[PDB]
Amino acid sequence: LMLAAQNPALQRVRPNGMSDEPQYKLEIDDEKASALGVSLADINSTVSIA
Amino acid sequence: KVNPDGSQVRLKDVADVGLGGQDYSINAQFNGSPASGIAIKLATGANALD
């Protein structure tokens, strides 16, 4: 894009798709999960099904 | 697993892990040197030269 725009043979050069956006990662510490007696598959099922 | 006395057992403790073949049955070599290949069958009605 920032090259084609310096090219006087083209114009209106745009990506068709979207641009990366912020997303909220979830970290799960399996150390504290299993230290609290809570499965891991039950965590995932909770986050999917809710 | 987590030993009921703190600490935990990991996959690396019970097994060895690495990228290897999905299947080890077939293998091949070309003039003696390790090799691979795809054999191609023609689609019915297609033309071998093309």
Curated annotation (Swiss-Prot), chain B:
Disulfide bonds: none annotated. It is found in: Cell inner membrane. Induction: By growth under severe iron limitation. Disruption phenotype: Disruption of MexA, MexB and OprM significantly reduces active efflux of N-(3-oxododecanoyl) homoserine lactone/3-oxo-C12-HSL/PAI-1, but not N-butyryl homoserine lactone/C4-HSL/PAI-2. Component of the MexAB-OprM multidrug efflux complex, composed of six MexA subunits forming a hexameric tube, binding to a MexB trimer, which interact with the trimeric OprM outer membrane channel protein. OprM is thought to not directly contact MexB; instead, MexA joins MexB and OprM by forming a funnel-like hexamer anchored to the inner membrane. MexA may initially form a hexameric ring complex with MexB prior to OprM, then OprM undergoes a conformational change as it contacts MexA, allowing the periplasmic gate to open. Belongs to the resistance-nodulation-cell division (RND) (TC 2.A.6) family. The inner membrane transporter component of the MexAB-OprM efflux system that confers multidrug resistance. Functions as the major efflux pump for n-hexane and p-xylene efflux. Has been shown in one study to be involved in the active efflux of the autoinducer N-(3-oxododecanoyl) homoserine lactone, thereby playing an indirect role in quorum-sensing; but has been shown in another study not to be involved in efflux of this autoinducer. Over-expression of the pump increases antibiotic and solvent efflux capacities. Implicated in the secretion of the siderophore pyoverdine. Pyridopyrimidine derivatives, such as ABI-PP, are not exported by the MexAB-OprM efflux pump, bind tightly to a MexB hydrophobic pocket and so potentiate the activities of antibiotics such as erythromycin. This is Multidrug resistance protein MexB. It comes from Pseudomonas aeruginosa (strain ATCC 15692 / DSM 22644 / CIP 104116 / JCM 14847 / LMG 12228 / 1C / PRS 101 / PAO1). The chain holds residues 252 to 301 of 1046 of the full protein.
